[PDB]
Design a protein around this ligand. Structure first.
Ligand SMILES: O=C(O)CNC(=O)C(=O)O
Ligand SMILES: O=C(O)CNC(=O)C(=O)O
Ligand SMILES: [Fe+2]
Ligand SMILES: [Fe+2]
Lengths: 332, 24, 332, 24
């Protein structure tokens, strides 16, 4: 049930703002950072929404005007799409899959250009959609630097230390239009996902649902993303998607969602909820040291077999036929 | 075989740990 | 067409002595050792029957009486079966496949005991079948030692040297009853197969017919053997067996068949042809150093993936499910 | 990955190259 905003400002959102899908879900726990149960969940690599970390407290005042004024003159990657779905793709892998035609295009622009573009669409009632996705770097201006330094490093540094994680590799700034969707995928880093403006519905699936989510081949540009179109699932090609069960939550300003490494996640900015802003914190996982093997360890194994086969065969497109030759009439 | 990389939905200017220290 | 024995002793064998199968074949060339074409075939890892190597000339006089009298008091492995098919199995892998029940049993006995057993079956009109399969070692007696030293080492040592092969690992002595069959399999060593007594029909298939022959899983005891029952092929489980095409020949005393490493082979002692005797020469292949990859190199790759997965998963029975999880809805 | 073993339809007393040299 949608939470009530403090001061009787009513429900933060309602059901009609959520897209409709074919599978059931259960709630991700929302807990205080001081609650032992929260620590237990993170330690066990299970998702949890933390409501009071103050992780990005200083960023809570951020909006397009403040960011335009203060984030510098560096380039920002902005994706443009004709659909609500911003399927991630790795440009470096496009050469090996000449027939992949991306539904979104990346354009590099200045922040004020992004803002102007957003304005032109609104005014001209356009259907175009934008999604800025840019790692925070040294070109940000003074006030942003001050804000960033005011993040709760004390709390997150202890988390990093407590879980044996590796280094912070980056902080991705995500600014999306209402209705934008990042289709289901998994990332190979640990993630504290800090919501700043607007609301995003996050649907997560544990690594043991690999068989239901059908990620692209490792050498395909959409490596790590699900092949299933959540809006029109093809059960003939992906029969186990009929067995998928998600963990879901809606995060708003001040909330931090822990998205454990290898956990699938689908993220959508609420319909009619205005623009959203998020900053993530990506950390490399702990070191690979016992049986029985965890699901995510089997996923790592599968990725490695795919990688080695591609290298040994000298052409990634030969991977499938060899794998098929290996299993038919022998293991299937 | 159990070893893993660190790929995410973003490409691989200081950032992350490097950005933070430079700033502090 | 069956060859004519010198001295007008008539056809060495006839069609009625060959078992009937579902696939076509083409002949393996029969050539003189001095024929450049023979060298070309061996160099290219293609089968050839050599008719005049004199490789085991001194063994041509061998028969059960002479061997019983001279081969020593060492133990011989003798397989016993209720069927004509002597499917090879690796006893060390039986623990991991508790449900595999071998159709043949190994018994260790003295040569004279083997001979006596053969006699008892004949006399009692029994249906039991025996197949002695024993590596030649230091317990053989003086005359056998003399015979062995009289093999054409000059010719085979040059072959070994010319092809860059590794060491001779062993010489297997095979003594079978008429009608005995060694079902289709491939070996990971180079083989000069020297026929001594009786006739054996050899059907070979190139490594690129892997998809048609369906070898057992690597960790199964029947690793390297085909799962297809040539006498009653199950096309539902093994549909590409409908596409298999063999290379065949019948070898007799004095003939040497080169069976190149990784080439599938099915070997049968002619029906009603009396006992057969063969001595093979097994050599380790040359060293693994260019694209495109050869079929046998892809076979090596597949074996390696199976091996690594078994070790990484810690249970070979987990190999299949992981492989299936890898390919369904992703590569198939 | 392209590397290979030397397994055949027989188990792994001198034999092969060792038998021959001992004899000669
Ligand atoms: O917020 C989004 O739309 C996408 N974010 C992620 O997938 C992530 O942070 O790992
Ligand atoms: O002769 C037989 O029956 C079996 N021989 C082989 O499979 C071989 O020598 O490699
Ligand atoms: Fe992600
Ligand atoms: Fe063999």
């Amino acid at each position: 049930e949608p939470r009530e905003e403090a001061g009787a400002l009513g429900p933060a959102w309602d059901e009609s703002q959520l897209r409709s899908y074919s599978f059931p879900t259960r709630p991700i726990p929302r807990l205080s950072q001081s609650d032992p149960r929260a620590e237990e969940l993170i330690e066990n690599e299970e998702p949890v929404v933390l409501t009071d970390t103050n992780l990005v407290y200083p960023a809570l005042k951020w909006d397009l005007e403040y960011l335009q004024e203060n984030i510098g003159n560096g380039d920002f990657s902005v994706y443009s799409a004709s659909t609500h779905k911003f399927l991630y793709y790795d440009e470096k892998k496009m050469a090996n899959f000449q027939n992949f035609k991306p539904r979104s295009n990346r354009e590099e622009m200045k922040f004020h250009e992004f803002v102007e573009k957003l304005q032109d669409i609104q005014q001209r009632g356009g259907e175009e959609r934008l999604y800025l996705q840019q790692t925070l770097n040294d070109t940000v201006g003074r006030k942003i630097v001050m804000d960033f330094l005011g993040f709760n490093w004390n709390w997150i540094n202890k988390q990093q230390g407590k879980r044996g994680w590796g280094q912070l590799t980056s902080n991705l700034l995500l600014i999306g239009m209402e209705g934008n969707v990042t289709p289901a995928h998994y990332d190979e880093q640990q993630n504290f996902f800090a919501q700043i403006k607007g609301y995003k519905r996050c649907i997560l699936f544990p690594p043991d649902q690999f068989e239901c989510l059908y990620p692209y081949p490792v050498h395909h540009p959409c490596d790590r993303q699900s092949q299933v179109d959540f809006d029109n699932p093809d059960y003939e090609r992906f029969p186990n998607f009929q067995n998928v069960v998600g963990y879901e939550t809606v995060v708003g300003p001040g909330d931090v969602l822990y998205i454990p490494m290898y956990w699938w996640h689908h993220i959508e900015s609420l319909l009619n909820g205005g623009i959203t802003i998020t900053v993530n914190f990506w950390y490399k996982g702990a070191p690979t040291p016992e049986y029985p093997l965890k699901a995510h360890q089997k996923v790592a194994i599968m990725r490695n077999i795919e990688k080695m086969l591609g290298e040994a065969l000298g052409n990634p497109q030969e991977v499938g036929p060899l794998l098929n030759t290996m299993i038919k009439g022998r293991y299937n | 075989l159990t070893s893993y990389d660190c790929e995410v939905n973003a490409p691989i200017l200081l950032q992350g740990e490097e950005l933070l220290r430079a700033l502090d």
